[PDB]
């Protein structure tokens, strides 16, 4: 499960082994994390541009 | 939603940037201004005398 | 003569007023120009009594507040008028709790919970409050239904709610104004 | 230069008094050696300034404790008179020497090495201000940028000497300006090192963990701790930072650890956490645990300050990678894999849960532990929001400061 | 002194003629600074700001302590006990 | 040598004065008259206190004085008469002017123009009393004659926003006098000032003189938190009308401050918590603003403790206010740990320091908000747990009774649980998926208008001071 | 000070007292103004009745209380 070679979770609960085989990440919302990081960046910077004005 | 909620904000940071930018040059003209007024004081007597 | 014996026990009778009103924001408001005035001067040591019933239900120990009511009628004057009064007020407020607590409760631990001792007046005051012991189980969800449709009846409604088609048509105009 | 880091690291034994006992009077035997060869009493008065009236204190020079396990530190004033006579005499002598130098002309050359000859004696003798001024000429009249390299590097070295982070923190910023002006190699591994070392004594392990690896592979000697030093600091920041697969391929295609195996007790304790860790066994995964506290942390300057941080932080690891592998688990059998008792385990998973960062409860009445760590679609979201919260607020503030203004 | 992260309302205001004056009016409207009271108060020098850590002295990154318990103590009383029971058993 | 100190200082004046001047004879502006009043204040105040005491007294003699100079002069005669610089010349003038207030034309008395000069003699004389920082009499003294004058004609635009800048000082120092000592006569003679506040508002709020306007609601509430009378000022906030787009930064930060103590003693933390953060941003990072800062963030500590939301470690330690935040501090380790008992050594060590800033009303809240965060902690350690565990973690007193204290909690939906009672037991309900759900577009769709408000504030400064320097002769 | 006594008069229903309660109300009443924009509703009731010859008053605190609501 540690390599996700076929991903799915042990149960000791019963006794079960659930073989979840199911997709994993969404990649337009996993991009839009680095989009966000890079805008988060950059209002630092415009923040620098700001010291002029001060 | 939530690009649509990404890039109105990505429009906002390119925005206050461009807030910045005009502001700057007011800053700029400011210097520009103060150095007319002495200067117009010479010009109008100038223009009257002929 | 601004600061007496007399407004130490009036200031006292009071704030139990205001308590038995069950509104905590006129008590805290009311509390803070104590402050200034007599709390610290003469002391609280009668204006102990609305100040500890107070602190025992912001922390929810129905317990303490019941016990301390219960002395506060050997205090035989004019502080046992609000008692009855408080008593009842402490059942008002534990049963908008139970709702969310508990979807099934016996006919005793109704009883036991509310503070009685007689079978009939739990459900007296089940009448007045609106729930249905049906076959001696409570039905708080049956409650909660009527509760929550009242609220979307009357009208203020579309926005209210939002539809998926309105979000988008707010943002557009926005962008284009 | 070469024998201060030894002293150094020795001396720090000294100042704690919970490494074992026998330990710091092999390592006390070995400081007075070299306070006489080395003159390093002005270092062994220094260690009775940072106490103050705290444990590792029983001085003759000054104030003593009775309360300290340490008594080899007990100076006499002997060494005392020692040292002034030393002191004096060497000074003048090699100074005399070195105007002569300075004295015979020409300037870029051979005043400049004069400059630097006057740096090592006061390095030396453990005083960082007499050293630093000397060698402010040096790099002040032009030199080679390699020289320039060694140098400021020289002093940041003062600064791990005393333990005095901050010194080698300014110092080191002037390396990576100058490093890629000199644009040299041979120096550019020592520089990893260091910056990796000071990553190393802060509280960023990141930095250090991506700079030590690189240290393993190719290595310069020069004011540098002794090799299997290197190697114990490397595998202390690849646990501390990576996670299981990283982890696990950084530690197999690294053949330099490898071929070393054990060859002093902290590798050891080290080396043993890290096969256990990624290879699930969990029954000796805890002794190895209580190994590397005593053997690993106690001894080293840098990590001594990370003592508690260290355990604090592992144990959170160990429990997320179970997690992960686990849908549900029983206390009892998450018990014995440990081979810690029922009671043991409870106490710690709620020290960790209301913080947050195991993501999983407990049903005690059931007897399991249940995990509703998220890692799909709303995983994803969590951390997107938060950051969006956040570039509204820092737009928020400036926005209004440019209006008004 | 600061407030917030150092650098971010640091950059974000500087003193101007026009704003001056009143800054020195809503200082005096609290009456004091309001760190010339507190030593006075404490009738020396504190106490409790040598704590923890980051308490001490702001020169470290936080490290999230406040109970400043070691835990090597509690755990090989834990690793000892288990094995006894067990061999016992 | 005396007199030539105060010559040089006073010309300085007269230039600052007589470009005012000008501008309000053409048209009554708002903000280019305020721009040059805002400097000069300043520098005035620090060539009066460093330099001088009739300094003040020259420039009173030497315009028209209707009352004034007497008035300098029995301030003067009590911390040290002066009866030099009456010399004649420097009272024959009346300074250089064009011809709006020249020696020969004021004189010849074709004009008399004496209305801002009384403006200008009434901030030199209310910032020396305040540069003295005696109070007694003096302050007194400095009430009765200034108000009254004011009042019997109708001020200009102009003269309505200085006299807001006189108003200030008026509050100050009578504050201070009362705060010293206890005379049971000042409590009569505060009543009169309550009613002066309120009339100077409304003479205000006909001419539309929108800084006066500000200026005057931050004195009013602060008069109330020093009274106790929190309960009229829940009627006085939710009737303002605040302006936001033509005052200084220096009264929207003291407003923004005001609120956050009247909401919080109401049990509303939510509000409270917003207004806060906002006063701060307001206010610089300076020692000019350090008694404000202080103030302002111990009372964001404590709100977010109210709410059991908790400040962060991070903020306390990057702060360089450890020794004053120090009550605080230990707050807010002792609401987290759910300690009762730490909790109770907690304000009991600290009860003086925190009385004086008068949080300690709002602080008596947490005995009960420190138990139920500390269920709180042993709901999520342990999902489904026994009636009994709990009791003996807090040291609760029985099964009963904690079942009471989650009871009133979770209808504050703090614990986020529910009791079974048929089984014993206390159990969370959270699992998330919560993605799924409509929730987080209910979300997304706030921030967005957050941002679209941005903008607008964005468009209407940037283009605006543009406009202006194209009607500006300057290429 | 507060307006909370001249509350108290009009809500007692003693006439004497309404009558000095509406004179004494319109003395103070562009400092209290707030809290008897509150209750001004009863001043109006009692100006609405045909018992009272100080209806003039009980119309005059509103017309400068109205004023300073900002209606």
Redesign the interface.
Same mark, same amino acid.
């Given at each position: 499960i540690l390599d996700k070679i076929f991903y799915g979770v042990l149960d000791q609960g019963n006794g079960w082994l659930y073989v979840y085989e199911t997709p994993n990440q969404d990649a337009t919302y996993d991009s839009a994390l680095e989009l966000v990081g890079q805008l988060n960046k950059v209002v630092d910077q415009l923040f620098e541009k700001a010291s002029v004005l001060y | 939603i939530n690009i649509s909620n990404n890039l109105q904000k990505a429009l906002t940071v390119k925005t206050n940037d461009e807030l910045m930018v005009i502001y700057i040059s007011n800053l700029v003209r400011s210097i520009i201004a103060f150095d007319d007024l002495i200067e117009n004081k010479i010009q109008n007597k100038k223009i009257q005398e002929q | 003569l601004s600061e007496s014996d007399k407004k130490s026990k009036l200031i006292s009778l009071y704030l139990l007023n205001l308590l038995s009103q069950n509104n905590?924001?006129k008590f805290?408001?009311?509390?803070? #120009?104590?402050?200034?005035?007599i709390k610290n001067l003469e002391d609280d040591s009668l204006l102990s009594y609305p100040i500890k019933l107070d602190?025992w239900?912001?922390?929810?120990? #129905?317990?303490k507040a019941w016990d301390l009511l219960q002395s506060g009628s050997q205090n035989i004057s004019e502080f046992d008028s609000f008692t009855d009064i408080l008593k009842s007020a402490i059942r008002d407020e534990?049963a908008?709790?139970?709702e969310?607590? #508990?979807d099934?409760?016996?006919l005793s631990?109704i009883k036991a919970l509310l503070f009685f001792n007689n079978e009939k007046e739990t459900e007296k005051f089940a009448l007045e409050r609106n729930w249905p012991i049906v076959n001696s189980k409570v039905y708080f969800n049956n409650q909660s239904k009527e509760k929550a449709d009242y609220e979307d009846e009357m009208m203020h409604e579309e926005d209210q709610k939002?539809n998926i088609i309105e979000?988008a048509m707010? #943002?557009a105009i926005?962008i284009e104004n | 230069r070469v024998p201060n880091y030894e002293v150094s690291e020795k001396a720090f034994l000294l100042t704690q008094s919970k490494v074992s006992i026998e330990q710091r009077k092999e390592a006390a035997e070995f400081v007075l050696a070299k306070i006489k060869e080395e003159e390093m009493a002005p270092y062994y008065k220094y260690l009775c300034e940072e106490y103050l009236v705290n444990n590792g204190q029983s001085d003759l020079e000054h104030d003593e404790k009775s309360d300290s396990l340490n008594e080899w530190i007990k100076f006499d004033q002997e060494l005392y008179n020692e040292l002034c006579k030393k002191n004096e005499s060497k000074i003048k002598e090699l100074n005399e020497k070195i105007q002569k130098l300075e004295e015979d002309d020409e300037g870029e050359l051979e005043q400049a090495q004069a400059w630097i000859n006057l740096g090592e004696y006061y390095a030396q003798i453990g005083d960082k201000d007499n050293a630093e001024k000397t060698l402010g000429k040096s790099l002040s009249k032009a030199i080679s940028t390699g020289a320039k390299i060694d140098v400021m590097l020289t002093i940041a070295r003062l600064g791990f000497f005393y333990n005095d982070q901050l010194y080698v923190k300014e110092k080191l910023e002037a390396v990576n300006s100058m490093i890629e002006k000199g644009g040299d190699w041979e120096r550019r591994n020592r520089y990893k090192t260091y910056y990796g070392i000071h990553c190393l004594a802060v509280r960023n392990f990141k930095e250090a963990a991506k700079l030590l690896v690189d240290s393993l592979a190719t290595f310069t000697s020069i004011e540098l701790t002794s090799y299997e030093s290197i190697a114990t600091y490397a595998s202390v920041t690849g646990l501390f930072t990576l996670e299981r697969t990283d982890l696990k391929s950084k530690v197999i295609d690294s053949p330099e650890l490898l071929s070393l195996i054990s060859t002093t007790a902290a590798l050891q304790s080290i080396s043993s956490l890290t096969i256990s860790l990624y290879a699930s066994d969990y029954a000796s995964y805890f002794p190895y645990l209580l190994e590397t506290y005593a053997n690993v942390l106690i001894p080293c300057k840098y990590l001594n300050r990370h003592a508690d941080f260290f355990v604090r932080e592992m144990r959170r690891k160990v429990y997320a990678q179970l997690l992960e592998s686990y849908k549900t688990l029983s206390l009892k059998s998450m018990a014995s894999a440990f081979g810690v008792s029922v009671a043991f385990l409870d106490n710690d998973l709620g020290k960790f849960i209301p913080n947050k960062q195991l993501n999983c409860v407990i049903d005690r009445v059931n007897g399991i532990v249940e995990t509703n760590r998220p890692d799909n679609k709303n995983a994803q979201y969590h951390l997107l929001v938060k950051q969006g919260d956040g570039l509204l607020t820092k737009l928020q503030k400036y926005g209004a400061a440019v209006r008004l203004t | 002194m600061s407030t917030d992260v150092a650098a971010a309302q640091a950059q974000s205001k500087i003193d101007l003629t026009k704003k001056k004056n009143e800054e020195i009016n809503k200082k005096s409207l609290e009456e004091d600074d309001e760190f010339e009271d507190f030593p006075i108060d404490t009738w020396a020098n504190g106490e409790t700001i040598k704590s923890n850590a980051v308490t001490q002295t702001n020169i470290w990154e936080e490290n999230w302590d406040d109970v400043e318990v070691d835990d090597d103590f509690t755990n090989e009383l834990k690793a000892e006990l288990d094995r006894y029971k067990r061999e016992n058993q | 040598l005396h007199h030539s100190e105060k010559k040089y200082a006073e010309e300085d004046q007269v230039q600052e004065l007589l470009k005012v001047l000008n501008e309000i004879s053409k048209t009554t502006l708002t903000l280019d008259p305020r721009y040059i009043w805002r400097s000069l204040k300043d520098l005035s105040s620090l060539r009066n206190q460093e330099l001088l005491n009739a300094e003040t007294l020259c420039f009173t003699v030497n315009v028209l004085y209707p009352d004034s100079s007497s008035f300098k002069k029995n301030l003067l005669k009590f911390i040290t008469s002066n009866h030099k610089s009456s010399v004649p010349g420097s009272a024959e003038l009346r300074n250089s002017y064009p011809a709006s207030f020249y020696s020969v034309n004021t004189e010849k008395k074709t004009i008399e123009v004496t209305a801002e000069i009384n403006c200008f003699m009434h901030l030199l004389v209310q910032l020396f009393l305040w540069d003295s920082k005696e109070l007694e009499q003096l302050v007194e003294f400095n009430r009765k004659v200034v108000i009254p004058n004011l009042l019997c004609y109708y001020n200009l635009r102009s003269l309505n926003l200085i006299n807001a800048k006189l108003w200030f000082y008026i509050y100050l120092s009578h504050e201070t006098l009362a705060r010293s000592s206890e005379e049971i006569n000042s409590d009569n003679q505060n009543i009169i000032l309550r009613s002066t506040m309120m009339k100077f508002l409304k003479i205000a709020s006909l001419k539309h003189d929108n800084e006066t306007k500000a200026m005057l609601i931050n004195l009013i509430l602060r008069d109330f938190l020093n009274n106790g009378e929190v309960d009229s000022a829940s009627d006085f906030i939710s009737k303002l009308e605040y302006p936001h787009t033509d005052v200084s930064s220096s009264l929207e930060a003291r407003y923004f401050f005001y609120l956050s103590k009247i909401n919080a003693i109401q049990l509303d933390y939510s509000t409270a918590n917003e207004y806060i953060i906002a006063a701060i941003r307001k206010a610089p990072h300076n020692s000019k603003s350090l008694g404000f800062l202080q103030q302002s963030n111990k009372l964001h500590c404590c709100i977010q403790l109210l709410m059991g939301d908790i400040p962060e470690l991070s903020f306390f330690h990057q702060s360089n206010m450890q020794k004053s935040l120090l009550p605080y501090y230990h707050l807010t380790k002792a609401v987290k740990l759910g300690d009762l008992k730490k909790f109770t050594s907690t304000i009991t060590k600290y009860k003086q320091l925190l009385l004086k800033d008068d949080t300690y009303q709002l602080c008596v809240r947490l005995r009960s908000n420190v138990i139920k965060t500390g269920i709180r902690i042993i709901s999520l350690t342990y999902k489904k747990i026994s009636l009994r565990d709990i009791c003996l973690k807090l040291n609760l007193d029985s099964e009963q009774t904690v079942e009471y204290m989650v009871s009133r909690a979770i209808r504050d939906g703090v614990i986020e649980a529910k009791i079974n009672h048929e089984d014993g037991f206390i159990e969370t309900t959270e699992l998330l998926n919560i993605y799924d759900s409509e929730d987080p577009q209910q979300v997304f769709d706030e921030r967005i208008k957050f941002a679209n408000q941005l903008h607008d504030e964005y468009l209407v400064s940037m283009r605006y001071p543009e406009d202006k320097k194209t009607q500006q002769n300057e290429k | 000070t507060t307006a909370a006594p001249l509350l108290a008069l009009l809500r007692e229903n003693q006439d004497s007292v309404k009558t000095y309660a509406l004179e004494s109300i319109n003395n103070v009443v562009d400092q209290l103004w707030s809290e008897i924009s509150n209750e001004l509703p009863d001043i109006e009731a009692l100006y609405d009745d045909d018992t009272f010859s100080d209806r003039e008053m009980a119309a005059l605190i509103a017309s400068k209380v109205y004023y300073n609501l900002g209606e």
């Open positions: - | - | 905590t924001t805290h408001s009311e509390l803070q #120009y104590l402050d200034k005035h602190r239900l912001m922390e929810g120990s #129905y317990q534990i908008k709790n139970t969310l607590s #508990y099934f409760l016996p631990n939002t979000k707010d #943002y926005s | - | - | - | -």
